[PDB]
């Protein structure tokens, strides 16, 4: 099984970024674990979430990744950060 | 300086609940610090947040907690509760900036 960790930075709180991300991951046969979650220090700053995505194999997982990038685009004010060797 | 710990439970994310809790505490002259945050296994499960509430004294913090208690009673997706500390004395004196 292959897994990669991604991070969502930005307006995580009142958006559907996370549910949408979670639905996508599961929709394609993957699973996730939220490894870190830090809320925006004041009700002003960017929260972030480190999500661990888990798959059968690297091509599988990456196919999910790429779709997760596409979601990042549409939903406004959320940045995706790569943690590992891209 | 007094502190009590509270916990929100339910649909923390995709709510405005958090910014509302924070706003209310700040409006009333307290400060808060988010201590823990746990997400459920599927978005249909409940998450929870532990938040420490800090005011000038117990009387006043109790005022805040009661406002926060009424907030949770209004919003249906979430319940609010207080946590008893494993420590008796929850007061801090002035200093520590």
Curated annotation (Swiss-Prot), chain A:
Top-rank taxon, per record: Archaea
Keyword field: Lyase, NAD, Nucleotide-binding
Ranges in a coiled coil: none
Its biological purpose: Catalyzes the conversion of ornithine to proline, with the release of ammonia.
Protein family per UniProt: Belongs to the AgrE/ArgZ ornithine cyclodeaminase family.
Protein name in the entry: Ornithine cyclodeaminase
Source organism: Methanocaldococcus jannaschii (strain ATCC 43067 / DSM 2661 / JAL-1 / JCM 10045 / NBRC 100440) (Methanococcus jannaschii)
